[PDB]
Structure formats: C-alpha cells, structure tokens
Amino acid sequence: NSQLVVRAKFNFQQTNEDELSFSKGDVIHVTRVEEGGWWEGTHNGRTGWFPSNYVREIKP
Amino acid sequence: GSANSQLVVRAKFNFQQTNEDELSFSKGDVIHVTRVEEGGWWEGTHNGRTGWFPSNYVREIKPS
Amino acid sequence: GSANSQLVVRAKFNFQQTNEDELSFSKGDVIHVTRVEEGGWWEGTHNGRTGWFPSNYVREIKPS
Amino acid sequence: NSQLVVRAKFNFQQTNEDELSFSKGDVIHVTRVEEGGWWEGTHNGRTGWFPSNYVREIKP
Amino acid sequence: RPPKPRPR
Amino acid sequence: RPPKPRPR
Prior knowledge:
The complex is a heterohexamer, with 4 copies of chain A and 2 copies of chain E. Chain A is mainly beta. Chain A has no helices and 5 strands. Chain A has one domain: Roll (SH3 type barrels), CATH 2.30.30. Chain A has a 5-stranded antiparallel beta sheet, with no helix packed on it. Chain A starts with a strand and ends with a strand. The N and C termini of chain E lie far apart (21 Å). Chain E contains no helices and no strands. Classes of the chains: A mainly beta, E little secondary structure. The A-F interface holds A 9-10, 12, 36-38, 51, 53-54 and F 1-4, 6-7. The PDB classes it as endocytosis/exocytosis. The entry lists the keywords adaptor proteins, Cbl, protein-protein interaction, endocytosis. It forms a hexameric assembly. Beta PIX-SH3 complexed with a Cbl-b peptide.
C-alpha cells in the first residue's frame, strides 16, 4: 500500500501512549499522511503517531 | 538496552478473542506489541498473527 | 496590497513560552512578524513585546 | 546601536525564508555588517538578509 | 478473577 | 492535539 518512507530529522520523545518515539536518523515507514501536524508510521515494528515536521521524505 | 525497541509483554491471564481482530492467548504467552493505545486495548503479534488484546491482561517484560 | 509589507499571522493554538525570549499567546491572537526563518521558529511582536514562536502554531493572514 | 542606514539600488526578491525583499529606493536600517556579500537589515519592521552590493549608504 | 477488559 | 514545535 504505502510506499512512503521518511527519515527522522531530530529525536522525538513520546508524550502520549499512541506516539512513536524515535532517534534522529531513524527510518520510518509512513502508514498514513494526515493534516494537523501528525502522521502515523512504523519503526521497529511499532506503529504510532509522530510530528510530520520532524521527518524528511526519502526518495527511492 | 537498545533505544525505542519493540515492547515485549507476557500474558498474565488466558484470553479468548471476542472479535475477529482480537488475539487469543494463554497465560505465559509472549506477545510483541505493534500498537500501544490508551483505552485498555493494545495491538500485538503472537503465533503468526496480529490482533488486539486487553492491555490489562499483560505485563511488559522490561529492559534492561 | 502594498509590496513587501510586514506579515500578519494569527495564532491557531495556545502557546506557553519555554524560554525567556519566546512569546506566549492564545489561539486567536494576532502577531506581527519581525523575523521569518526556517527551522520552525519565527520572531514577532504581540502585546508590547518581541519574541520567538513556533511557526507551525500560526497561519498567515494573507493579502490581498 | 547601529546608526547605519542604506538605500536600495535595485529591487531584491527573496529566495530564502530569512531574506529581506525590498524595492529600489527603499530605506533599510542595517543591523549587522558582515563579509560575504550579505548584510542584515530592517525594513517595514521585518529583519532579514539582503545583498550588500544592492545598497548604497545614506549619510546623515 | 481476571481483570475486566474495557469496551472497545 | 497541537503540532509539535521543532527544537530550537
């Protein structure tokens, strides 16, 4: 389905149960693009929400 | 341990799925968590499938 | 409108300053921008003071 | 602090977020003189970077 | 007596 | 859920 992959620009620390914490440089597979400043993605098999302004798209 | 690692939890009680998208497991079973959410239900994998389960039926095996 | 006019933005969410040089404002508040910079933080004036604020917390009121 | 004021010799169009666009003949209050071809200044209450070779000093 | 799951 | 500001 989703072929969108992004890279973490900075460390992100979860502040809510459904958030996806990650380290700068992590590779995240985006599961849903949503307006509002938050996207859903998967890293290390865990799926959760992260700030869309914290990542950069990685082109094939 | 390694940062932002996938959570590992152990079943503390038996659970029979009440819906098709729910997991069924036995006390002692190990589940790898895919979705942590508030509301009493988490998503995880076990025995080859992915499903929802009562978060209060498990206890995380904590690092480190 | 008039060329190269100072930007006017409206707060879309409440914001509490995390540092002394940051602005504090409430949703609906109007800020006059003094510095536009990449990196997620802009400088502006509001209620008599000048400070930094999250550019993603505001929406520019566009001319014309 | 800075008593330096210059006048725009030509129109300048911003190409980056932190640049100060202006029209020929605009009066700019210089906030910092820097080598490299770019100075920081204020016009219309906005402070940003502009080409130093695009302005002429206005003496009192 | 196992805990009661919350409604979904 | 307000957007997350980037670090300064």
